[PDB]
Amino acid sequence: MEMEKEFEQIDKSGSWAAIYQDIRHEASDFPSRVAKLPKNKNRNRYRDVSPFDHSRIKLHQEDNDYINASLIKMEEAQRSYILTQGPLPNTVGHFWEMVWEQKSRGVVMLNRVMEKGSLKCAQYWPQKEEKEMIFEDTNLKLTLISEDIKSYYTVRQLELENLTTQETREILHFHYTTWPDFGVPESPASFLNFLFKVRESGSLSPEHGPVVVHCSAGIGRSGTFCLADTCLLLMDKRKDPSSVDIKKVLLEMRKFRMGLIQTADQLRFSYLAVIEGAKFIM
Numbered sequence: 001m002e003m004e005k006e007f008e009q010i011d012k013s014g015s016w017a018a019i020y021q022d023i024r025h026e027a028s029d030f031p032s033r034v035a036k037l038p039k040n041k042n043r044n045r046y047r048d049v050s051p052f053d054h055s056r057i058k059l060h061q062e063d064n065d066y067i068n069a070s071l072i073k074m075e076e077a078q079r080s081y082i083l084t085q086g087p088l089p090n091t092v093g094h095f096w097e098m099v100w101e102q103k104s105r106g107v108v109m110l111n112r113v114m115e116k117g118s119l120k121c122a123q124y125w126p127q128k129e130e131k132e133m134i135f136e137d138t139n140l141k142l143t144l145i146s147e148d149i150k151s152y153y154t155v156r157q158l159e160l161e162n163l164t165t166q167e168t169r170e171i172l173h174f175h176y177t178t179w180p181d182f183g184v185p186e187s188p189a190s191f192l193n194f195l196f197k198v199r200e201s202g203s204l205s206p207e208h209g210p211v212v213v214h215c216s217a218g219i220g221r222s223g224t225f226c227l228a229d230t231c232l233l234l235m236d237k238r239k240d241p242s243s244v245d246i247k248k249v250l251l252e253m254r255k256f257r258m259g260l261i262q263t264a265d266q267l268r269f270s271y272l273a274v275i276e277g278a279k280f281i282m
């Protein structure tokens with residue numbers, strides 16, 4: 001079926017939970033043996049969210065190459081994304097090692113450091129120009145260059161220096177700051193505006209490594225971001241945009257990382273964002 005009218009048909013019939021459970025039943029199951037090794041317990045935020053072995057990002061290190069991060073490669077759309085958990089106190093250096101080694105231009109953050117009164121990820125970037133951060137375990141230096149605070153999101157320019165080689169690179173930090181503590185946003189308008197700002201920066205384009213996108217677990221809000229982007233790109237590329245099937249795209253993405261889209265409300269919100277975004281594109 002088309003999307004917008006399939007949407008109204010699920011709303012009127014109140015069957016979002018049944019649609020979402022079908023997705024969960026059909027989703028791929030692949031091994032995640034490296035994630036479950038005992039030496040990696042303090043590298044995982046949640047015991048039930050792990051990268052598959054076949055698609056995990058490897059650190060360029062011979063001691064321990066593990067990070068909770070996955071490469072999502074979308075062949076027809078010609079987009080790649082790295083989805084990862086919010087960094088932990090003992091993985092902030094690994095996080096920036098990955099950004100460096102994979103040649104990423106942008107980092108997309110969809111959570112606040114504290115939500116619901118608890119910590120959802122480490123404070124992994126510097127908050128003042130004159131107070132830089134050094135990660136001694138991976139030999140990297142990180143400096144805040146500039147910051148632009150808007151009503152729904154903040155953009156930061158950061159300098160990442162490889163202290164072994166003295167090479168430097170400019171990284172863009174796109175921070176969506178207004179996702180509610182419970183539920184999903186009422187309108188997709190500010191999320192779409194944010195997606196378009198990431199796109200306009202070059203961070204999603206083939207001349208750079210894959211964008212790094214995270215929330216707390218790296219599957220819920222993060223899944224929404226890449227699902228919406230990929231569906232809108234396919235609607236631009238194809239002769240028949242109504243042939244884009246959002247449930248099939250999501251199942252394809254779940255071949256590369258488990259659990260993408262965590263609730264039926266997140267699924268409905270993804271539909272809403274693609275539907276509204278397709279009208280603005282033209």
Ligand SMILES: N#Cc1ccc(CCO)cc1
Nearest residue numbers: 074075076077248249252
């Ligand atoms: N890119 C891309 C892409 C991903 C999924 C699908 C659905 C396959 O039946 C089609 C295209």
